[PDB]
Coordinates of C-alpha atoms in Angstrom, one line a residue:
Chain A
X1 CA 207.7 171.8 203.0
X2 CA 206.5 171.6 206.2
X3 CA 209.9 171.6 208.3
X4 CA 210.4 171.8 211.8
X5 CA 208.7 174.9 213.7
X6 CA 211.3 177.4 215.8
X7 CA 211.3 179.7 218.2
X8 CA 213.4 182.4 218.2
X9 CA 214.4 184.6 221.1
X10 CA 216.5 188.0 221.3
X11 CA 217.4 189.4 224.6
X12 CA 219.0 192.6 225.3
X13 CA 219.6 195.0 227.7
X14 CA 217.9 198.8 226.5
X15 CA 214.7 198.6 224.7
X16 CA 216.0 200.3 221.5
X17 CA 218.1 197.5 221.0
X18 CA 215.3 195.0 221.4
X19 CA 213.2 197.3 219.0
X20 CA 216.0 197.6 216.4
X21 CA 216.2 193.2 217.0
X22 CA 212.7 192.9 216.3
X23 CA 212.7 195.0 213.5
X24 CA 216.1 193.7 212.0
X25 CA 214.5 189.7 212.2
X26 CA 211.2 190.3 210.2
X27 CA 213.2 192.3 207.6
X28 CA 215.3 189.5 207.1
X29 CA 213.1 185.8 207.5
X30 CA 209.4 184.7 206.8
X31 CA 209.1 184.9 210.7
X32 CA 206.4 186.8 212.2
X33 CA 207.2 188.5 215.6
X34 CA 205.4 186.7 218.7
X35 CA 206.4 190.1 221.3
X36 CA 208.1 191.7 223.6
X37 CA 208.5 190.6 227.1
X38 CA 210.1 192.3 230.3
X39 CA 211.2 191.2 233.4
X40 CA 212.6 194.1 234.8
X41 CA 216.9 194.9 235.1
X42 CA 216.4 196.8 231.7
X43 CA 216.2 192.9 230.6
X44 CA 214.1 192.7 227.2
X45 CA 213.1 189.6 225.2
X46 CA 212.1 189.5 221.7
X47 CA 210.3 186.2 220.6
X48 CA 209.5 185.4 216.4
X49 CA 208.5 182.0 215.5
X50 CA 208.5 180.3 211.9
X51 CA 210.7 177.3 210.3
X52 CA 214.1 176.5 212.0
X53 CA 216.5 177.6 209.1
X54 CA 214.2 181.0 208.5
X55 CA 214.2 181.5 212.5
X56 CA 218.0 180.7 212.7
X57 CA 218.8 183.2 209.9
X58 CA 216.2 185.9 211.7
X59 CA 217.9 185.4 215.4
X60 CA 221.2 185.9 213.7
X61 CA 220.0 189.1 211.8
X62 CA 218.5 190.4 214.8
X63 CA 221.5 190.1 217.8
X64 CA 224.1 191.4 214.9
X65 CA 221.3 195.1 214.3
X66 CA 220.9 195.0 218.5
X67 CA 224.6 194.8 219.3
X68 CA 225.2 198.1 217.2
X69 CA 222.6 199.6 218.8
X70 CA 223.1 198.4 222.4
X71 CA 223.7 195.2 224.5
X72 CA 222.7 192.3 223.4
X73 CA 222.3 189.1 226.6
X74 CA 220.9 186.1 225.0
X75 CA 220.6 185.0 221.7
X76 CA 218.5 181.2 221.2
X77 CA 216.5 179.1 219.0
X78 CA 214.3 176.6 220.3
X79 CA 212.9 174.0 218.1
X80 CA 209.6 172.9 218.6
X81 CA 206.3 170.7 218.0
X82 CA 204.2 171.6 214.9
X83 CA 201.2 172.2 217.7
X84 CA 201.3 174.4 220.8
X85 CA 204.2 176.3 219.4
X86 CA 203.6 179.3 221.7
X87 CA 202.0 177.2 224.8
X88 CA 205.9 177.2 226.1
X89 CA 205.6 181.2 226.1
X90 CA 204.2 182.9 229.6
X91 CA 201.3 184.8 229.7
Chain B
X1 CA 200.4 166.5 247.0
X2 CA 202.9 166.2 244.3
X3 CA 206.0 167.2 244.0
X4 CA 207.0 170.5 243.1
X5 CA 210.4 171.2 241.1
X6 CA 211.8 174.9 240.2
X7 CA 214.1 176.0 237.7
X8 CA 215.5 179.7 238.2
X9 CA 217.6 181.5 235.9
X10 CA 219.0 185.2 235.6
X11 CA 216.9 186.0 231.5
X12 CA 214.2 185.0 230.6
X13 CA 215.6 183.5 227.3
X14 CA 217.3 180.9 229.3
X15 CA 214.2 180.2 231.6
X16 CA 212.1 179.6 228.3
X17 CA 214.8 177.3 227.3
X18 CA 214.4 175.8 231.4
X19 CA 210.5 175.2 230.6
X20 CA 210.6 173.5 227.0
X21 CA 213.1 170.8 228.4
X22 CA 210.9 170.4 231.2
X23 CA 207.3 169.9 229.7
X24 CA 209.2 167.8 227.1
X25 CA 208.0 164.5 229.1
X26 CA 204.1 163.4 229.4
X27 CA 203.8 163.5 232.9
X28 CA 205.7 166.4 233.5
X29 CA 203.0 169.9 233.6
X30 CA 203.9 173.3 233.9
X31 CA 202.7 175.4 236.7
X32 CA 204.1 178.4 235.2
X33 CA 206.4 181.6 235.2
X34 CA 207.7 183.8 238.3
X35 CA 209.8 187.3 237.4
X36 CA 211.0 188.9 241.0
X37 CA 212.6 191.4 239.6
X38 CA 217.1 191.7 239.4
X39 CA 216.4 189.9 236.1
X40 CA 215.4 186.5 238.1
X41 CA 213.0 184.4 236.5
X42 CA 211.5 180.9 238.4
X43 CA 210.1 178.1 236.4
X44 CA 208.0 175.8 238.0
X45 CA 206.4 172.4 237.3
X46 CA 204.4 169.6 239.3
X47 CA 204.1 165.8 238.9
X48 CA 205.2 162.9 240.8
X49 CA 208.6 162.5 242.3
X50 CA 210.7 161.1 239.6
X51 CA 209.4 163.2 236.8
X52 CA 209.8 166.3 238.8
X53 CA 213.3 165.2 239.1
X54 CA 214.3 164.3 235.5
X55 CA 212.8 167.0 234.5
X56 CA 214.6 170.0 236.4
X57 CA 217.8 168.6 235.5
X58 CA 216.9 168.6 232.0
X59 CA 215.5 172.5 232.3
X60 CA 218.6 173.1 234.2
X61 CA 220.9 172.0 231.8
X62 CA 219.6 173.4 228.8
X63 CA 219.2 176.9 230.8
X64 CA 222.8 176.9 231.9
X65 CA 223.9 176.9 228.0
X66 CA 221.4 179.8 227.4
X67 CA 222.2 181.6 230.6
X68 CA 222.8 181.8 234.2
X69 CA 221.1 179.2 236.4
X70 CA 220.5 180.6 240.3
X71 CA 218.5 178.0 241.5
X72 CA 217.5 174.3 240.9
X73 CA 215.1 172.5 243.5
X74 CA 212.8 169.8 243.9
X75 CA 210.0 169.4 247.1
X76 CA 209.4 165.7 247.0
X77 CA 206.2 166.3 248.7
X78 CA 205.4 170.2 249.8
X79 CA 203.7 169.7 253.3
X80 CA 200.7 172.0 252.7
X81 CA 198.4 172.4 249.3
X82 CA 200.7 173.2 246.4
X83 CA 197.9 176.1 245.7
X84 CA 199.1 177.3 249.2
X85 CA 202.7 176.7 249.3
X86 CA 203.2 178.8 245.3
X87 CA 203.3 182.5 245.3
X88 CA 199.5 184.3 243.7
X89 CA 199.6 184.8 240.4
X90 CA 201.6 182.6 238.5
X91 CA 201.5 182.9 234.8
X92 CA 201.6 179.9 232.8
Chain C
X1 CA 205.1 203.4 207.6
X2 CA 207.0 206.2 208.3
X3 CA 210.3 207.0 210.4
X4 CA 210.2 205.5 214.4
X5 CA 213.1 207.5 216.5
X6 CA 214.4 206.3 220.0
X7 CA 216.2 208.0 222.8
X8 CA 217.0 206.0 225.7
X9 CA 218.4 207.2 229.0
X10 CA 218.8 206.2 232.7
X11 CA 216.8 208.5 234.8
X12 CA 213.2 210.4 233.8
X13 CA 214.5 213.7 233.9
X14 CA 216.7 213.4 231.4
X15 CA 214.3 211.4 229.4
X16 CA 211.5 214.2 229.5
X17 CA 214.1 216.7 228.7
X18 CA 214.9 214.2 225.7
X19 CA 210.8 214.1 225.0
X20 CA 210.9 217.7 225.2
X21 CA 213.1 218.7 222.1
X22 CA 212.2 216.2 220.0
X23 CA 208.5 217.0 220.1
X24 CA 209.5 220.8 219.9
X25 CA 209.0 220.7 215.8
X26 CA 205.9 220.0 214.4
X27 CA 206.3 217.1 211.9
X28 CA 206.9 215.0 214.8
X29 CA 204.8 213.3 217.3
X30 CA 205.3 211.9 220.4
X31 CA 204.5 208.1 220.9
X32 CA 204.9 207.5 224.1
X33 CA 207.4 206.6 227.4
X34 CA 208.7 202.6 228.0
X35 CA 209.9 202.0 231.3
X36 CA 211.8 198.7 231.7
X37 CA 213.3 198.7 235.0
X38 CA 217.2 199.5 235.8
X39 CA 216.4 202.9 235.3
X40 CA 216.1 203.0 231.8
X41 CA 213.8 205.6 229.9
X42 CA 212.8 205.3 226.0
X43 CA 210.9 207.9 224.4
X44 CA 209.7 207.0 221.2
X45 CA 208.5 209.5 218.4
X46 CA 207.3 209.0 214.8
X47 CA 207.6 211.0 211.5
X48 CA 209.2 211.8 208.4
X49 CA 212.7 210.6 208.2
X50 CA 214.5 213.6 208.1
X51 CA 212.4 215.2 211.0
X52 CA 213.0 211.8 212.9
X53 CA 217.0 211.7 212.6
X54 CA 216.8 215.7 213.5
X55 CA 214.5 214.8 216.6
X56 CA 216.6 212.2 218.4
X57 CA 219.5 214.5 217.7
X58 CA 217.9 216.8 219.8
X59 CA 216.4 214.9 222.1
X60 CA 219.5 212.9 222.6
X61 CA 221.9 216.4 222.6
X62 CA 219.3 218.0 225.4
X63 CA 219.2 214.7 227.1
X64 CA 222.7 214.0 228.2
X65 CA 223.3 217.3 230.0
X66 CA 220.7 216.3 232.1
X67 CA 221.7 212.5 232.7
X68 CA 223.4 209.5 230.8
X69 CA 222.2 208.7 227.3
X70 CA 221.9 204.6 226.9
X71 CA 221.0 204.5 223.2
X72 CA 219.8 206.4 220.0
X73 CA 218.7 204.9 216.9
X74 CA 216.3 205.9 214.0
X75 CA 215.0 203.3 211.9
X76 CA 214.2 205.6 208.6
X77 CA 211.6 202.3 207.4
X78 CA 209.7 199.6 209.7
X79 CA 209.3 196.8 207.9
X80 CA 206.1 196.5 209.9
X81 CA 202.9 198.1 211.0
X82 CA 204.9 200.5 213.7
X83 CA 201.7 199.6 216.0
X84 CA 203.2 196.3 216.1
X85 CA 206.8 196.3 216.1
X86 CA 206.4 198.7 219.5
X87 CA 205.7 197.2 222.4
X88 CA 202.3 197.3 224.1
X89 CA 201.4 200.1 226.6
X90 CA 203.2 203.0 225.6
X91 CA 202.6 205.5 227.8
X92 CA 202.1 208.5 225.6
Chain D
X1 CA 198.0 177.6 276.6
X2 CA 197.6 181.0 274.9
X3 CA 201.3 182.4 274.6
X4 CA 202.2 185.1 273.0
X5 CA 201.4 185.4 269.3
X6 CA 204.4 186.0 267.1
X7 CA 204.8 187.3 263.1
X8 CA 207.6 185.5 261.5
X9 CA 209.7 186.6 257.8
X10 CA 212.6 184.8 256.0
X11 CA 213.8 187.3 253.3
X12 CA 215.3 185.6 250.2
X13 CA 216.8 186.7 247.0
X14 CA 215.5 184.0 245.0
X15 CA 212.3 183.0 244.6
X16 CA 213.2 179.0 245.1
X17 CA 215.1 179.3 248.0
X18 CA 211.8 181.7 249.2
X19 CA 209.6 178.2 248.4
X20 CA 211.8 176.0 249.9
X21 CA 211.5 178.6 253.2
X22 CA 208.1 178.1 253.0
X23 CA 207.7 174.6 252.8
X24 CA 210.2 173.4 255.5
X25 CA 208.7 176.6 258.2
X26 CA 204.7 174.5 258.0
X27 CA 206.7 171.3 258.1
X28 CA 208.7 172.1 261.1
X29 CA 206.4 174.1 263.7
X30 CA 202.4 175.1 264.3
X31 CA 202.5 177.9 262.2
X32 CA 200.7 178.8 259.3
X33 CA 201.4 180.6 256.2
X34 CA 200.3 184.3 255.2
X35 CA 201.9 184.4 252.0
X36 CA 204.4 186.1 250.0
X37 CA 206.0 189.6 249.3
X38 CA 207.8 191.1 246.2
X39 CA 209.6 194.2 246.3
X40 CA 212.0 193.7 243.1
X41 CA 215.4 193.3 243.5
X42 CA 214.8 189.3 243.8
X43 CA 214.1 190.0 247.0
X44 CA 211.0 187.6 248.7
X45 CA 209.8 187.7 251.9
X46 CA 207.8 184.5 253.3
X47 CA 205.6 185.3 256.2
X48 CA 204.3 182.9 259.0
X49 CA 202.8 183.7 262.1
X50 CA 201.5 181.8 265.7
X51 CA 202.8 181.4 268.7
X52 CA 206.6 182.8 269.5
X53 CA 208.3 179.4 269.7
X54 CA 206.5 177.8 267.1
X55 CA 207.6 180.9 265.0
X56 CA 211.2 180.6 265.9
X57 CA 211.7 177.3 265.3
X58 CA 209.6 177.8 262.2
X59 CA 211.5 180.5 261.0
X60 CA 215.2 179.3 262.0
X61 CA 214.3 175.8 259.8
X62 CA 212.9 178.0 257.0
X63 CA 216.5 180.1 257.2
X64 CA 218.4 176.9 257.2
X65 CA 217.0 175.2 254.4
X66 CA 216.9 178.3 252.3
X67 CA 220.3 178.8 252.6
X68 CA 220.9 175.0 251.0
X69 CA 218.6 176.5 248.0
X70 CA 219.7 179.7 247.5
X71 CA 220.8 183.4 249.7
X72 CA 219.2 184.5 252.8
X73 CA 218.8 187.9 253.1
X74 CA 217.2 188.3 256.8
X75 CA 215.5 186.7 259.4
X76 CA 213.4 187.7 262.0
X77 CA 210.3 187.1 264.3
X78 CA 208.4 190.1 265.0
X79 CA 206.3 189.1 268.7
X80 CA 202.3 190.7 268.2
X81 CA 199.4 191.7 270.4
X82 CA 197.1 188.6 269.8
X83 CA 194.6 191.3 268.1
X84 CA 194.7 192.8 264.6
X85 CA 198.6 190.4 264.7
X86 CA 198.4 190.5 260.4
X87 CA 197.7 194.6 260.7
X88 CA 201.1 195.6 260.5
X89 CA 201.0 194.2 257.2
X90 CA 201.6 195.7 253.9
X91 CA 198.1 195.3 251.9
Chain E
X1 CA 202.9 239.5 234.0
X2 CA 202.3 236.1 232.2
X3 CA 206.2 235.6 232.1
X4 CA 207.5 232.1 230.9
X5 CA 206.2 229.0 232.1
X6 CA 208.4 225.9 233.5
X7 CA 208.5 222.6 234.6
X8 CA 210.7 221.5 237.5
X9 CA 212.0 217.7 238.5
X10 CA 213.7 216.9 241.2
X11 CA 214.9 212.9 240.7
X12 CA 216.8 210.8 244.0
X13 CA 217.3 207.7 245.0
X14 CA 215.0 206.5 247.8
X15 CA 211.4 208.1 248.2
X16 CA 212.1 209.7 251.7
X17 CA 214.5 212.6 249.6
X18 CA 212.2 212.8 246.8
X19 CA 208.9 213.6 249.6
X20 CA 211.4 215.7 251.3
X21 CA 212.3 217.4 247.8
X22 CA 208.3 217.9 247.2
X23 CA 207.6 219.8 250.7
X24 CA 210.4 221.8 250.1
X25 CA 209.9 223.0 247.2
X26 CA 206.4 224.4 247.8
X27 CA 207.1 225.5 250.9
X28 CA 209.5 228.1 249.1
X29 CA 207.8 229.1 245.7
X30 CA 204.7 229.8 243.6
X31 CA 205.0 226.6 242.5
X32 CA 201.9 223.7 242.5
X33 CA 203.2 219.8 242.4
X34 CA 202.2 217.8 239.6
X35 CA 202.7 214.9 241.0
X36 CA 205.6 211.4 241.9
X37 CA 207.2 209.3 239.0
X38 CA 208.8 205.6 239.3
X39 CA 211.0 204.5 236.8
X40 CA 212.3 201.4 239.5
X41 CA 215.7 201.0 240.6
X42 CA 214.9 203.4 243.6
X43 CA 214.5 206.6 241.1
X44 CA 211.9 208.9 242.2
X45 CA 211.0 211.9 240.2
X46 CA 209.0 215.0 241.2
X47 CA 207.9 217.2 239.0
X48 CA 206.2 220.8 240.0
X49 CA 205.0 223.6 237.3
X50 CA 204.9 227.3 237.6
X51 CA 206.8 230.8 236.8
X52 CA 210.5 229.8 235.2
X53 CA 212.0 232.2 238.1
X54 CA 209.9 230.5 240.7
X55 CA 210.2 226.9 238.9
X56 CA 214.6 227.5 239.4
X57 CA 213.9 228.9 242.8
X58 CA 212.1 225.7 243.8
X59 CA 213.7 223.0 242.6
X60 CA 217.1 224.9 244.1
X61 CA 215.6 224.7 247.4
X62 CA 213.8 221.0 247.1
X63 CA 217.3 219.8 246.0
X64 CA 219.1 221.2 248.4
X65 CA 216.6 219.7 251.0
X66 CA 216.4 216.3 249.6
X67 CA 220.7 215.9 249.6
X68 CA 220.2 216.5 253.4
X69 CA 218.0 213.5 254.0
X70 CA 219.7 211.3 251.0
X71 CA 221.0 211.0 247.5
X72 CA 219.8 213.4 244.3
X73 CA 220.5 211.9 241.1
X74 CA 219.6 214.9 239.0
X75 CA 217.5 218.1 239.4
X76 CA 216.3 220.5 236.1
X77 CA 214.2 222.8 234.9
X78 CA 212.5 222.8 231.4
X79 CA 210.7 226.2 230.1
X80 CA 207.2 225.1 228.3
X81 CA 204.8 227.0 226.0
X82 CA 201.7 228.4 228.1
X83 CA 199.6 225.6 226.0
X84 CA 200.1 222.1 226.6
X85 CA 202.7 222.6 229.9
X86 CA 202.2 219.1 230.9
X87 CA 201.4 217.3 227.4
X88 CA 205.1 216.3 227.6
X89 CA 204.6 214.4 231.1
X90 CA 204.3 210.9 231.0
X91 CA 200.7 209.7 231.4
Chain F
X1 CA 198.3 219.6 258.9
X2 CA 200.0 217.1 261.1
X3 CA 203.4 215.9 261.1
X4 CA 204.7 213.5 258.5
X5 CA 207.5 210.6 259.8
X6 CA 209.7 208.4 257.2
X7 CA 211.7 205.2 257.8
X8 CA 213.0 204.0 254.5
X9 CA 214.8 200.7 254.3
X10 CA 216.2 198.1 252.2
X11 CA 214.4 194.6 252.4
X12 CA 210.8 194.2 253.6
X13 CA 211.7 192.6 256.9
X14 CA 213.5 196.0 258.2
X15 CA 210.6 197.7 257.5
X16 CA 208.0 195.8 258.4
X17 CA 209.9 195.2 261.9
X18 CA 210.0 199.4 261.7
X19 CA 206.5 200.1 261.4
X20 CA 206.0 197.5 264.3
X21 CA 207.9 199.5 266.5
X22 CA 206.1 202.9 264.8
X23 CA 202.5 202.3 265.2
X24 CA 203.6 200.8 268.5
X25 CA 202.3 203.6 270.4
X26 CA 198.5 204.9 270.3
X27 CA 198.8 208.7 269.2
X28 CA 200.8 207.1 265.8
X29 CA 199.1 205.9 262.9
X30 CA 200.3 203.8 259.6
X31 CA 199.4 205.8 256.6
X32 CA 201.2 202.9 254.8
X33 CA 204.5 201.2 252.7
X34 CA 205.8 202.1 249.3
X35 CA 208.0 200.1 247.3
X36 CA 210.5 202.1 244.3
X37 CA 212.6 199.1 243.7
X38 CA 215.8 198.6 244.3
X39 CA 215.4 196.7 247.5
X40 CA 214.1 200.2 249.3
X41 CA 211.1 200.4 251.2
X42 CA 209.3 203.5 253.0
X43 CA 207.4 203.4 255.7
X44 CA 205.2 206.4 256.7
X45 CA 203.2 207.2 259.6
X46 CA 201.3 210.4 260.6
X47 CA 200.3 212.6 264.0
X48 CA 201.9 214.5 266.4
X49 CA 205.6 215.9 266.0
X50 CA 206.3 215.1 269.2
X51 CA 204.8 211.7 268.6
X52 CA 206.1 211.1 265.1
X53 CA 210.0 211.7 266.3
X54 CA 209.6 209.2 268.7
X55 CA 207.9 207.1 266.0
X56 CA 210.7 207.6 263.6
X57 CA 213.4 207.1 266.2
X58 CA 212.0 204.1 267.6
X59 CA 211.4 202.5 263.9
X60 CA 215.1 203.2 262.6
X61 CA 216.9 201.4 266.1
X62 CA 214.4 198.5 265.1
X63 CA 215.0 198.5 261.8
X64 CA 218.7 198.8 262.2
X65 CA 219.4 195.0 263.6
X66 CA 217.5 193.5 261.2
X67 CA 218.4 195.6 258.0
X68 CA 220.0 198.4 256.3
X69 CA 218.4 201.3 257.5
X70 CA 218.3 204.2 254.0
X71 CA 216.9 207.4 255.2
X72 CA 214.9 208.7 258.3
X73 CA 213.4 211.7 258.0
X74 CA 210.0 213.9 259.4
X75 CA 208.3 216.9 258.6
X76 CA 207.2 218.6 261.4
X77 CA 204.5 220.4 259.1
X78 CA 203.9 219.4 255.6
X79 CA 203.1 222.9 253.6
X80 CA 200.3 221.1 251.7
X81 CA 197.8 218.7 252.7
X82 CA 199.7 215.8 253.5
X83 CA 197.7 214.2 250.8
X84 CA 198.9 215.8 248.4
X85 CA 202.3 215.7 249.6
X86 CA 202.3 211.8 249.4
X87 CA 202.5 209.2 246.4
X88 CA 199.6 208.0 245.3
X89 CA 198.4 204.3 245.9
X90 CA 200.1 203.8 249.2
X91 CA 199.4 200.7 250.9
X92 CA 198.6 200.4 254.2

């Protein structure tokens, strides 16, 4: 249907948490996981990407598996372009 | 030359957030990412005076919905070489 | 494929004397160490599912006499390629 | 008139106010600027160097606007034989 | 008289305990050091190998050291197989 | 062989304004810094005991007024080759 492209982004603090995220949101959408990222403070981000509605419903899947596993920070969606999807992402 | 506007945030979820608002206009371009460590994560973008302003107020306010904001600056014009003046190693 | 098993705690000690019961049967395997700042430790092992769930146990039973345990999960079925829903660089 | 040569650090946590230290220190005095210095904790250290009043006025207008950015941490000018000046330097 | 074979860690805060911790505990046993481990946050882990009697005797004396110069988070001793003593380390 | 002196602070600044004093006289020499996070940096310089107290001593008053000093500490003589005895990748 070609829809609008998401982002999706899971933040916890633990990295079994962010694991259990990541594997919680491709169980659930048609999203495919971008990564992990760190930044140090036990902080770690979980990126998918994919349609809005399939990223919103994979986000949503994810923080609810990480928060009975450990702490979930952030949880966001972040619509963007059909092209460059992932040029927002750092390197 | 240009000026150089910075958008820092405690995540990196909300920083993310801080750099899609900001490329969002033509003129604005993204320099790239900064992590210091204490969960602290610097955004940073160049262009002329006016864009540079719009657009950290627009990565500033979608960060702070996302997550903390620490830190929201513009340099009209940095005295020295922006190459110079930016920490090595910047990851776009 | 098969079974991926976490023990998380803050401090290395503890973490290795996590690593060290769970590896201590043979049908499992030791993946590797993830360090991600704060102190945190994960130690990350792969199997069957009843050898998994029996590992972190262990690991997680040795571990907190030795420090403070921050998490324990098994997840009995990746839904992906284990090689890709782990994080790069595991320091095995 | 060949003075005595100074090394000069503002310590911020914060990378912007650490920038912002930068920038205003060139603007202000004859100094010039050696780089930067990570060593977690958001902490950032912005080194100058040249001679011992350019460095202090340098480095007390770096502190100042910094502190309209973001937190100071410390301040200080470190006076230097004028050889091997950058050699107490961390590599 | 091939007894049992151990692994000894001796984890502070701050490096200057943890150096303190390693000079210590070779000065008093049979023991060789393996090596230093960061893990951030100011936790620094030392790790020596060697007899399980001489391993305890060590890392009793490199604690006991290290709490004079600063702070000891945790200290232990883990017996190994005489195969594969240091497979369990982190690489 | 030789004697072994630490001054460990938190923030660069202290310790950079601690090895000043350190290598200040001739018979002292800089092996290095090392950073383990948290803010805390180590400073460590080699040579005489005699020398190296006076090093150390001279490095913490420094230190002191301009940060937090953590830990002071020397060896008079390391019981291993004080290559051994020290971390690996220490920057001079």
């Amino acid at each position: 249907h070609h829809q609008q492209e998401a982002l999706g982004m899971v933040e916890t603090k633990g990295l079994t948490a962010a694991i259990e995220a990541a594997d919680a949101m491709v169980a659930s959408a048609n999203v495919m996981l971008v990564g992990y990222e760190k930044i140090g403070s036990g902080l770690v981000t979980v990126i998918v990407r994919g349609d809005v509605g399939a990223v919103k419903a994979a986000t949503d899947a994810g923080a609810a598996a990480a928060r009975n596993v450990g702490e979930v920070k952030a949880v966001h969606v972040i619509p963007r372009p059909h092209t460059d999807v992932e040029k927002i992402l750092p390197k």
